[PDB]
Specification:
Chain A: It comes from Rattus norvegicus. The structure is cut from a larger assembly and holds 2 copies of chain A. With 43 residues, chain A is mostly helical. Chain A has 3 helices and no strands. The longest helix of chain A is centred in the last third of the chain and has 8 residues. In chain A, 0% of the residues are buried.
Chain lengths: 43, 29
């Protein structure tokens, strides 16, 4: 039965922040790093 | 002319914006 079941059978930025195992980075000097540094949202 | 509007912070009806510690006026809500 379980073989039959086997054969038969991140989605956003928040899901990325929650997952610490996956690593994420940005360009060292750019609008992206500055935007993250100056941001005030929790994520 | 202006109306005195009363409210309470019962989300999501009324809630302060991001970093609202520095935010004031009608914009802070």
């Amino acid at each position: 039965a379980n073989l039959a079941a086997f054969l038969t059978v991140i989605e956003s930025a928040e899901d990325l922040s929650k997952q610490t195992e996956i690593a994420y980075g940005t360009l060292d000097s750019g609008s992206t790093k500055e935007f993250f540094r100056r941001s005030k949202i929790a994520v | 002319k202006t109306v005195v509007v009363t409210t309470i912070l019962e989300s999501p009806y009324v809630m302060m914006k991001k970093n609202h510690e520095m935010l004031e006026g009608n914009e802070r809500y």
